[PDB]
Design a protein around this nucleic acid. Structure first.
Lengths: 207, 119, 54, 142, 7
RNA sequence: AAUGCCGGUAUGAGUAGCGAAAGAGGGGUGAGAAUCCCCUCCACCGAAUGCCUAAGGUUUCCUGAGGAAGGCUCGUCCGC
RNA sequence: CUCAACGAGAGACUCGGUGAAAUUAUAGUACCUGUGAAGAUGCAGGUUACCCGCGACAGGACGGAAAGACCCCGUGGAGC
RNA sequence: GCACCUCGAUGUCGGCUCAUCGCAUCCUGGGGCUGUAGUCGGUCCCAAGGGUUGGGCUGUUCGCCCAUUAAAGCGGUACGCGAGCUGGGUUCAGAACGUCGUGAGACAGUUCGGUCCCUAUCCGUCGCGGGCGCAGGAAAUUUGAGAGGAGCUGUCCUUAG
RNA sequence: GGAUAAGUGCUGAAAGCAUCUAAGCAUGAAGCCCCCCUCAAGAUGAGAUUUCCCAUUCCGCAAGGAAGUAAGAUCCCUGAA
């Protein structure tokens, strides 16, 4: 498999080869430098480390500076592993760019979703709402916790809490256009997360 | 997003106009820190309105400056003070006409106080 | 909404573990001291980096 | 008046081979070894038992039709959380926790039981990484 | 009857 | 050991509440000021939230000091 | 409501000041299946579980508040 | 049916909200026998993974009807759930109709109207922190013992009239 | 994909035949265990890889205890994706 990880900028619309109008998500995801190659005889599994969005030396630690010394590159903000890529096909310090994806391919997009704060059960779990009239004092409440006989609430009872901030994967999106000059990926559909957050684009599980 | 400061929007506008004008006459006031943070952008916007010096900017500033006397035994209003002293004082400076310096907490309610001054 | 049993002394003291409050961010004032909490004007001398501004 | 050892217990290391025995008859002997029932200095509150290593856990066998009839249950704290597998699937993939569940069932329940469970070491055959302890080969009484 | 009308 | 009587002290717990409805700043007093005094804006009632006059209360009215307790916080202030 | 989504204010949240009440055998107070005065946090067998908090919900503690009002008894009473 | 537990209180119907469990399975999946020519069927097996509706009438569950659907399944959980919600009916104090009673009054006969309290201590659940451990102190990246989520299907065209 | 339920079987004797079974092999369901997604070493069984910091001072003859610090982090401040 193949993949690359970067920052998304925002959404736009692009018409392509017909009159049809396509919702397009823009992702800056290049260049990515291979930092570490995981091997089965040493680490127990096969993976590669990709680094993205290098930063100033003031914001990087001495272990972070020493970890990227082997790849001959600046310390980078985002490090994630890809598993399992076609071993080996990449050497340590080789730049991964957006040219690996053609503009007709099917990819998997994952990322940390937008935070919503501590929210009620109606918004967090999609639970239906109580009546506002005919004497009713009941609305926006989670419901009965369960029966009487267990003398307890069963685990998994849906209750208000914090929504968002979790990893969400959207499957089988399509690349609309690839921009090798400006390091941009144009992806059909919606992408989870807020603006300028980390987005990982990996090849889909075919077929 | 702007702060609400525990007030109604009309009360917010009235209190911000009062604090802006009172800073414009007395040149140094002592409020809470969040009131200072909400006040400084409005005050530098009104100083920017005073920078232009034309009649339309003065009529824009007249909708915000309250009618209190600025300079005694001169009959100078605050609206005249913006276009006579503050604009000529801050002609070279591009923004940052106010600074906020924090003080200790208040005795009665633990409110963190701040010094606001025109610089 | 009614307590079934009273709280014992040990459970009350265990709940009051985090009720304590911390030492403020107090530092040496370069003018006189002592001492001055960080990012505020000193109440003794009225100075802040480093002019007497009161 | 009688002797009661504490912090003077000498613990040996034993190797038990499970090629031809049952799940089963060896597990009670291993639990009795781990409790310290073979030593005359047994004291019930200080864990006089010694370490044991079991090799060839995949070579274990059990009589009757228990390969398809014996069912292991690992129920969660969630409703409908009853998960089940047969003895054949538990032996084929990883019979180590089969043997440790047998020993944990025959060990006493408590802090000493969890302590004596720590001396047990079950491995897929036929090598163990405890050659530095120099373990001796133990033959089963029957 | 068992009417819950406690005052 | 009476859902006993009286007195003292806990738990809940630093929890609920602090009782409709606009305050802001600059000076003053003072050991101590978000709450007291003065000034300037802003706001509210205005067939009243204005004026007086019964019933009723009875000193609560004024001046000078004071702040213990009472102001559901503070208090240099008050119908204390 | 289908079918709910935003916005404003008060409480709830944090900090400063002040600060109760119902209740309370002691309590280091898990779950399943049984047992038991026949419906278990405390019993038995097993399965799980590092210590201490904060914000929420209310299934249980046959929760609290009222010596059940229904039914029955009293060789009780009262009204008609 | 009995009266074992509760009368120094275990709130009782029907709906709303939230569900969970067992198949004696309504559909979907795989089969046997058919008096199964094919479609549609009948009966009996294996199978709880998922889904099993919008109304008119009545307080109603139930039931009848309208229009769909792949089907509109039976039950348990204090006939699940009122310290989560409503009181329309039962089930107070008022007033009538019919009947019984001389009468005061009575009627699982009817109708009109009729106060539903609680600031969560503990266990449970949903989220978020602070410690300590993991035989040196750290910054990152991670394998996975285990656990949770998802799991449904219609119609049309070819093969092929 | 793997082992399967009901079924369909192959080769076959107890019982010279016959036979789905008592040994050995299959095929077979929206059931099961994975492949799809997510949390996951407090998994006290606390795992693994990479890269920094170094091995001071004073007491305690041993165990150990205090002060400063390196790598690094925090108090305090500007803010929100």
């Amino acid at each position: 498999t193949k993949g690359i990880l970067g920052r998304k900028i925002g959404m736009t619309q692009v018409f392509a080869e017909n009159g049809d109008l396509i919702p397009v998500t823009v992702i800056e995801a290049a260049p990515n430098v291979v930092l570490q190659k995981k091997t089965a005889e040493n680490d127990g599994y096969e993976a590669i480390q990709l680094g993205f969005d290098d930063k100033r030396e003031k914001l990087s630690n001495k272990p972070e500076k020493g970890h990227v010394a082997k790849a001959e590159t600046a310390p980078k903000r985002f490090v994630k592993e890809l598993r399992g890529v076609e071993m080996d096909a990449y050497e340590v310090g080789q730049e991964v760019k957006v040219e690996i994806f053609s503009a007709g391919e099917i990819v998997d997009v994952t990322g940390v979703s937008k935070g919503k704060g501590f929210q009620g059960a109606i918004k967090r779990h999609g639970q239906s709402r109580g009546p506002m009239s005919h004497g009713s004092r009941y609305h926006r409440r989670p419901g009965s916790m369960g029966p009487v006989d267990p003398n307890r609430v069963f685990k998994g009872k849906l209750l208000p809490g914090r929504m968002g901030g979790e990893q969400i994967t959207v499957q089988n999106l399509e690349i609309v256009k690839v921009d090798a000059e400006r390091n941009l990926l144009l992806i059909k559909g919606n992408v989870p997360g807020a603006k300028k957050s980390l987005i990982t684009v990996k090849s889909a599980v075919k077929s | 997003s702007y702060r609400k400061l525990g007030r109604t929007s009309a009360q917010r506008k009235a209190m911000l106009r009062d604090l802006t004008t009172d800073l414009i006459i007395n040149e140094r006031i002592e409020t809470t820190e969040t009131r200072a943070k909400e006040l400084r952008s409005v005050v530098e916007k009104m100083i920017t309105l005073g920078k232009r010096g034309d009649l339309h900017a003065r009529r824009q500033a007249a909708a915000y400056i309250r009618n209190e006397v600025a300079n005694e035994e001169n009959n100078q209003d605050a609206l005249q003070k913006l276009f006579s002293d503050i604009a000529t004082r801050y002609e070279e400076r591009q923004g940052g006409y106010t600074r906020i310096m924090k003080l200790g907490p208040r005795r009665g309610d633990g409110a963190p106080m701040a010094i606001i001054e025109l610089v | 909404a009614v307590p079934f049993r009273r709280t014992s002394k040990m459970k009350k003291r265990l709940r009051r573990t985090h009720f304590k409050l911390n030492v403020p961010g107090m530092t040496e004032c370069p003018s006189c001291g002592e001492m001055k909490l960080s990012h505020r004007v000193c109440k003794a001398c009225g100075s802040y980096n480093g002019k007497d501004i009161n | 008046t009688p002797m009661a050892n504490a912090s003077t217990i000498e613990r040996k290391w034993l190797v038990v081979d499970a090629a031809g025995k049952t799940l089963g008859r060896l597990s009670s002997e291993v639990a009795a070894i781990l409790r310290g029932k073979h030593k005359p200095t047994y004291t019930p509150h200080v864990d006089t038992g010694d370490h044991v290593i079991i090799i060839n856990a995949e070579k274990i066998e059990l009589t009757g039709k228990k390969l398809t009839d014996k069912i292991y249950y690992r129920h969660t704290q969630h409703p409908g959380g009853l998960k089940s597998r047969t003895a054949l699937e538990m032996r084929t993939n990883y019979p180590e926790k089969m043997l440790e569940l047998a020993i944990k069932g025959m060990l006493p329940k408590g802090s000493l039981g969890r302590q004596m469970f720590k001396k047990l070491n079950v491995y897929r055959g036929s090598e163990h990484p405890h050659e530095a302890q120099k373990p001796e080969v133990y033959e089963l009484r029957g | 009857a068992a009417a819950a009308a406690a005052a």
